[PDB]
Structures are given as structure tokens and as C-alpha cells.
């Protein structure tokens, strides 16, 4: 949008977290298959 | 949990979750300044395994 550039606006998730027992976050930075157990 | 500038009062005791690591006597236990340390439901060198 004007800036010819893409970029995060909105992370419309959730309102609360109250208890938080595990955490984890990645080092920064077709088909896509995946399984889930 | 130990090392902290200043700690709550006990009207006010604080508490923390501990998870996903490891979690050693080996230097805890074996620091000389601990006046206490009396375990109830393990004896204090079976904690590390
Ligand atoms: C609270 O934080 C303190 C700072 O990291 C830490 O003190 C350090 O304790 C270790 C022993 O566990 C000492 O280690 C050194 O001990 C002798 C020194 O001559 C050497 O034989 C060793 O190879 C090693 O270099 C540190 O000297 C000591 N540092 C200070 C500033 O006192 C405490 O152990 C931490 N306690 C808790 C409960 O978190
Ligand atoms: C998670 O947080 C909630 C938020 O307070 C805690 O829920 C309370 O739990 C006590 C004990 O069962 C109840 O008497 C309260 O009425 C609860 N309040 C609410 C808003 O739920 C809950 O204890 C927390 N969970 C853990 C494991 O600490
Ligand atoms: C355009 O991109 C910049 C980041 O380079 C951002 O600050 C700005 O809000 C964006 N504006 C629009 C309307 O996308």
C-alpha cells in the first residue's frame, strides 16, 4: 500500500494468556506437507 | 531465583514456573551460604537424576 512494500498490520489472535506453561520462538529470519499427532 | 537484587515478603511470596531445562544441584546445593536446605520427599543428592 503507496510504499510498494509488504508488512504485518494486524495480529488478530487472541485478547488474553493468563497461565503460560511452554514457550519457544525460533531464530530469526509449492507444496507443504505436514502431520500432526 | 536465588542470585535476585530483592525478593518479595512472605505476605507477598512470590513464585516461579520452571521448565523445558535442566535443573542441577551440582552448583546449588554445594554453595556454602545455604544456612537451610532440608528436602522432605528425596534426599538431596538423588534431586539430579
Ligand atoms: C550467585 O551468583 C554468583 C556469581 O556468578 C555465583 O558465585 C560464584 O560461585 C562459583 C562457585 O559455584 C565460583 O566459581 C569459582 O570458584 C573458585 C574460585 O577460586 C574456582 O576454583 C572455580 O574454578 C571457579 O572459578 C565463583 O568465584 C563465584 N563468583 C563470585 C563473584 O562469588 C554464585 O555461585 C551464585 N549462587 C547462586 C545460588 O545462584
Ligand atoms: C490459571 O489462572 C486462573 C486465573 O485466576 C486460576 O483460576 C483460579 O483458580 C482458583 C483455584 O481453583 C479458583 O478458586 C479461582 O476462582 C480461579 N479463578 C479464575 C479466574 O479462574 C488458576 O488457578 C490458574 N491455574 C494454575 C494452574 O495456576
Ligand atoms: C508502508 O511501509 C512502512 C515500513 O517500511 C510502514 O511503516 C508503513 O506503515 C506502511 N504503510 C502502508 C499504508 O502500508
Known sequence: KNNKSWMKSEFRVYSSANNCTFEYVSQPFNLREFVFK | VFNATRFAS?????????????????????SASFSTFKCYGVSPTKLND
Open chain 2, 10 to 30: 512472605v505476605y507477598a511470596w512470590n513464585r516461579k514456573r520452571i521448565s523445558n531445562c535442566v535443573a542441577d544441584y551440582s552448583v546449588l546445593y554445594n
